[PDB]
Amino acid sequence: EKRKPIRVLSLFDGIATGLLVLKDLGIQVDRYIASEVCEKIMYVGDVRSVTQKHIQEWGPFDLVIGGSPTGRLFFEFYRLLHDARPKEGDDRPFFWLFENVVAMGVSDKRDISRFLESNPVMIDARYFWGNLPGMNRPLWSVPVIRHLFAPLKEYFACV
Amino acid sequence: GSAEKRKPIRVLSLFDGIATGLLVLKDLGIQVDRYIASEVCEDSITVGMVKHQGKIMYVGDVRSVTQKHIQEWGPFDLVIGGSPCNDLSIVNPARKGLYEGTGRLFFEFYRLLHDARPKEGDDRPFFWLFENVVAMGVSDKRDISRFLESNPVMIDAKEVSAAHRARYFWGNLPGMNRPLASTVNDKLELQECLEHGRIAKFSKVRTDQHFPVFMNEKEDILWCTEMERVFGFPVHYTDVSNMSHLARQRLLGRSWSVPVIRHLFAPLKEYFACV
Amino acid sequence: GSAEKRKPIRVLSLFDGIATGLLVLKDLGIQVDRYIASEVCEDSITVGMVKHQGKIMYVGDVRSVTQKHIQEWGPFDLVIGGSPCNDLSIVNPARKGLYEGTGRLFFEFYRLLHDARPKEGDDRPFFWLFENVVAMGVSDKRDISRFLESNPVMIDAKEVSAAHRARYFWGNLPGMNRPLASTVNDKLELQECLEHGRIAKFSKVRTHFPVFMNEKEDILWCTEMERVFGFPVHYTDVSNMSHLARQRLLGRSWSVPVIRHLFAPLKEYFACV
Amino acid sequence: AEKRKPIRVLSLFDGIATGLLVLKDLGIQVDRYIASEVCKIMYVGDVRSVTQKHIQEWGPFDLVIGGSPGTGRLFFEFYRLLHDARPKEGDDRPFFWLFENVVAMGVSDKRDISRFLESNPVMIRYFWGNLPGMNRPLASWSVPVIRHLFAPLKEYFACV
Ligand SMILES: Nc1ncnc2c1ncn2[C@@H]1O[C@H](CSCC[C@H](N)C(=O)O)[C@@H](O)[C@H]1O
Ligand SMILES: Nc1ncnc2c1ncn2[C@@H]1O[C@H](CSCC[C@H](N)C(=O)O)[C@@H](O)[C@H]1O
C-alpha cells in the first residue's frame, strides 16, 4: 500500500532504452531484466530461453515493455506479458508498453490491437500500445516513451 | 478425491473442420453437454451442421472470439484445435512460417486456451489438444512447444488405418504416448477401403505419377467414399451440399484421422458422463 | 394350368441407366436369375456395377446386340427399357423426332423385343415395358403405340413421391392402369426429402430455387433428389462424379415407387425370396 | 415343295405401281398386290392405317418391297411391314424383300439400315435385299435395275 521501486521485464530491441527512460523520470528500479528476440539489472539472452518458470523466479514484474523503433517480436512479447501478468484477484499495479513502426501491415495492426485489447497511440511516426493512463485510445523514441511513462511516477517510488 | 456424478463434457473446438471431435466423442459414448466450434469454411460448416443434426453451435472466425465470450459461453472441459498448416509445411516453398500468414492462427489457439483454462485454485479436470503436421520447420515446432509448454507426441495414422499421416499432437490428455490398440474394426489396408470391383496397388496411401487403384483395365485415383474409409470416417460423411469431388477430397485432406483421435480421446471416459 | 416350381426372373434391360429395374425387383423380393443391361454412359454403368455388386452383365451399346445374342443369352422373361428422349421432347426446338437423331433408338428396343418374344406356341409368361415422356409430339406417340401395338398408360410420380414426373408406359405387365397404392414408405412432400435445416418452398418439385436454408435460397442436394425420386440415399455417390453428373443421372431415371407399382404383379409369376 | 404359284406382293414403295410393272415385265403371275405409301390388286392408303391384323388378312405375302428412288421414317415403316409379313419360324416357304434408297444418305443411316436388315447394300442408288445375287460382303423412274434384281423371282413363282 506504499510506493516501491519498479520491476521491469524488457523484450525491447534496445536492451537499455527502458532503464534510461525510467532513470530519466527519476523512478527507482529494484529489478530490470532485458531480453532480445534475435533469430539487479540483468541480460538473459535469447527470449527463446526465457521460460515461464524464469518469469516466475525473476519476478514479480510491474512493467513489461517490448517492440522496436516482423510480427514475431509481438507474439513473444505477448507470451511474456501473459506469463508476467498478475493472476486474477491480484489488483497490484501492472503496466505494459509495445512499440512498433507505423509502416506495418494493416492486418498486423489489427491483430495486435485485438490481442492487446487496446488501440494504438500514433505519434509522428510510430505506434504505441499500452495500458498507462493516457494511452487509452478509441476506435530516437526516448523522450516520447518518457512522456508516455510519466504516469509511472504516480505508482512507483521515485528517488 | 471427492464424490460427484460424472457430468457430460463441454468442448471448445477451434478450426473444427468436419467436426471430427464431436464424431469421436459420440463414438466413445461420452455424453456431450455442448460443443462450440469455430470454423470459416462453409463446406465444413455444412458437413458438421448436417451430420450432427444442429448440435454444434458455430461461432465463425476464431479471431472474432474474445475472452469475454470464453467466460460467458464457458466453462469448457476440453479445448481442441488443428490450425491451418500451409504456412508451416516445409513442402510449401512460399511458407511464411509460424509468425506470419496463416501460421499465426496458432496463437489464436494459444490465446483462447489461456482464456479458457481454470483460474488458480480450480482443480476441475481440464484438457486441451493442438494438432499440426510433422513436416514443419524445426524452429516452428520448437516455438510451438515453447508457447504450449509441452512437447508433442508423434502419431501416424498408418499404425491404425490405411493412410500415411504422421502428425504432432500437443496436449495434456492422459496417456497420449501410450501404444495404440489395433482392433478388428480398423481397416489397415487400402484394399479394405475400396469400392466393389477395384484393386489396391499399395497397402497404404499417401496424401506424383501414381493412381492408387486399378479398375478393370484402367488406373484411377481414390473415390470420396474410399477416402472416407481411409481416414476412418463413416461412408458418405462428406456427401452434402452438392460440393465437387475436389471439395470433398480437400475437406478430408485437412482432417484428423478418426481412429487416432479416438485413441487420444478414449481416456476421457474416466472423467465425464458416458451413455 | 400346370404345376411347376416358381423360377427366378430373367431380365433384359435396354438403356438401363442407374439400374432402377434391378433395384425395384430386389425390393419386391423377386429372385433375379440374370440381369443383362445395355448402357453406354460410364457413370451409369459405374453406379449399377457398384450398387449391385457385379450382378449386372453389361453388354454395351444396344446397337451391338444382335438377334443371335438375344437367343444365346436368353431366354428372357422381362424386357424393359426407356430410350433417350431429347429428340422426342417438345421442349427441345431442335428435336429430330422419333425417326431421326436419338429418337430412332426406340426401334432398337422394338427390334430386340421382337427377337426376345417367345415363338408361336410358347405360352410361357413374357412381359415387356417401354417408357418415355408425356411431352412428345402427338404423331410420335401415335407411332410408338402403333409399332408396339399397345396404348400407353400415363403415370405421374407425383402420386407416390414429391416429384412432378408424368410418363407414358407401354407394356403388357398385369394391371398397369390399376390405382397406385400410397404406402408409408412414400415421401409425398418435398420437405420429407430435405436434409437437416432446410425448408421446402413447394409441396412437390417440378424439375426455381426449391429450398430455403438459413434464410438463403438453394437448389436440391444430390441426396435430396435421391429421396425425391425414391432411390436410397447416396445411391449415386460413386466415381467422383460432379454434382451435375449426379443430377443428370437422376433426372433421366425412372421414379422408383412407380416402377415398384408396375413390377409388383410379377410376384405371382416368379420365385420370391 | 409344291408347284409354282403366282406371287403375292406387299408394296410400301414410293411409286405405287413400280413393282407390279417390273413383275409384269418379267412375266411373273401376280395373285395379290397391296400398295401403300408413308405420305385383288388393292391400294390401302396411309401405312399408319395398316396394322398387323391387316397384314395377316390380306396375306400371306411372298414379296415385300419398299423405299424411294430423312430416310428413317420410310425405312422403319418398311421394317415394320417386313416383320409383320415375314413367315413364322419353321415356315420354309419362299419369302423375299427389297428396299431401295438414294446413295445420298447419312453414313449412319446406311449403317443402321444394313444393321436392321442384316445385309449389305448393292450399289448401282442403294438396294438391300435377300434375292439371290444381292448377297453382298462388308463394304469398305428407271425400273430395269429392279428388273434384273428381281430376275431370280421367276425361279420361285409361277410365270405367265
Ligand atoms: N480464421 C479462422 N477461424 C476459424 N477457422 C479457420 C480459420 N481459418 C481457417 N480455418 C479452418 O481451420 C481448419 C484447419 S484444418 C483442421 C480440420 C479439423 N481438424 C478436422 O478434422 O476436420 C480448416 O478447416 C479451415 O477452414
Ligand atoms: N446407344 C445406346 N445404347 C444403350 N444405351 C444408350 C444408348 N444411348 C443412350 N443410352 C442410355 O439410355 C439411357 C436413357 S434414360 C433411361 C434411364 C433408366 N430408365 C433409369 O431409370 O436409370 C441413358 O442413360 C443413356 O445413357
Author numbering:
A (entry chain E): 629 to 667, 680 to 709, 727 to 781, 791 to 805, 893 to 912
B (entry chain B): 626 to 832, 845 to 912
C (entry chain A): 626 to 832, 847 to 912
D (entry chain F): 628 to 666, 680 to 709, 726 to 780, 792 to 807, 893 to 912
Q: Could you share sentences copied from the article?
A:
DNA methyltransferases DNMT3A- and DNMT3B-mediated DNA methylation critically regulate epigenomic and transcriptomic patterning during development.
Despite numerous efforts, we were unable to obtain crystals of DNMT3AR882H or DNMT3AR882C with sufficient quality for structure determination, due to their strong polymerization behavior and low solubility in solution. In light of the fact that introducing a secondary DNMT3B-converting mutation, DNMT3A R676K, partially reduces the polymerization of DNMT3AR882H/C, we set out to prepare R882H/R676K- and R882C/R676K-mutated DNMT3A MTase domains for crystallization, which led to successful structure determination of DNMT3AR882H/R676K at 2.48 Å resolution and DNMT3AR882C/R676K at 3.2 Å resolution. The structures of DNMT3AR882H/R676K and DNMT3AR882C/R676K both reveal a tetrameric assembly similar to that of WT DNMT3A, with an RMSD of 0.29 Å and 0.33 Å over 800 and 811 aligned Cα atoms, respectively. As with WT DNMT3A, the central subunits are well defined, each containing a largely intact TRD and SAH-binding pocket, whereas the corresponding regions are disrupted in the two external subunits. Note that the introduction of the R676K mutation does not lead to an appreciable structural change for its surrounding region, except for an increased distance between site 676 and residue E820′ from the symmetry-related subunit, explaining why the R676K mutation partially reverses the polymerization behavior of DNMT3AR882H and DNMT3AR882C. First, unlike R882 in WT DNMT3A which is conformationally flexible with poor electron density, residues H882 in DNMT3AR882H/R676K and C882 in DNMT3AR882C/R676K are associated with well-defined electron density, suggesting reduced sidechain flexibility. Furthermore, unlike residue R882 in WT DNMT3A that makes no appreciable inter-molecular contacts at the RD interface, both H882 and C882 engage in notable intermolecular interactions in their respective complexes.
